[PDB]
Amino acid sequence: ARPLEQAVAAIVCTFQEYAGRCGDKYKLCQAELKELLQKELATWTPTEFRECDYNKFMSVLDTNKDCEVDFVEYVRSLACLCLYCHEYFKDCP
Amino acid sequence: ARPLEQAVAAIVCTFQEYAGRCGDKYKLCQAELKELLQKELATWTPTEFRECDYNKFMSVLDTNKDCEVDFVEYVRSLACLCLYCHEYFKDCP
Numbered sequence: 001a002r003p004l005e006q007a008v009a010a011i012v013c014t015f016q017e018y019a020g021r022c023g024d025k026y027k028l029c030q031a032e033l034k035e036l037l038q039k040e041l042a043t044w045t046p047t048e049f050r051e052c053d054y055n056k057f058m059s060v061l062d063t064n065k066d067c068e069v070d071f072v073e074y075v076r077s078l079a080c081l082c083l084y085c086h087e088y089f090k091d092c093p
Numbered sequence: 094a095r096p097l098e099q100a101v102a103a104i105v106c107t108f109q110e111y112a113g114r115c116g117d118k119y120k121l122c123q124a125e126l127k128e129l130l131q132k133e134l135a136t137w138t139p140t141e142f143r144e145c146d147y148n149k150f151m152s153v154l155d156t157n158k159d160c161e162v163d164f165v166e167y168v169r170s171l172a173c174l175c176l177y178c179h180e181y182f183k184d185c186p
Binding site: 002003004005006007008009010011012013014015016025026040041042043044071072074075076078079080081082083086088089092093 | 103105133136
């Protein structure tokens with residue numbers, strides 16, 4: 001019915017797929033977040049200008065693989081990827 | 094298409110729909126954010142022990158109707174709604 005309801009339900013579903021693997025079901029570690037972004041958003045690539053920002057963002061996740069990531073931070077990461085890879089934000093400050 | 098890519102692209106779609114109405118295409122005011130949430134996620138309701146949190150969240154948007162939020166802030170609001178209305182987080186601290 002409503003597109004946004006299914007979309008948000010889907011981002012929770014993906015979080016559950018990775019966070020539910022083992023341990024604390026409400027958390028991911030940075031390694032898992034990196035894996036999730038690489039596998040679940042595999043076709044998303046940086047726009048002509050946010051290439052640097054993107055490369056860094058993804059690289060940074062590797063510096064502390066065990067670091068905890070909660071749901072809000074996971075969703076924020078998705079948002080950042082939109083700013084880096086979605087054409088709508090190409091001109092966004 | 095990958096489920097998460099479709100989901101995130103839809104989240105951007107909705108934002109663009111509301112933010113593109115008039116003014117700064119990269120911003121919404123909290124009044125419009127509340128409008129978006131009540132219309133796009135109309136069937137989403139707080140879980141058993143998050144009614145108070147949810148009520149405060151919704152009341153805060155009214156108190157700050159004219160404040161603006163960018164895309165990241167908008168996505169953050171969606172994350173918060175998951176914490177309040179999605180069963181997966183029912184017992185999340």
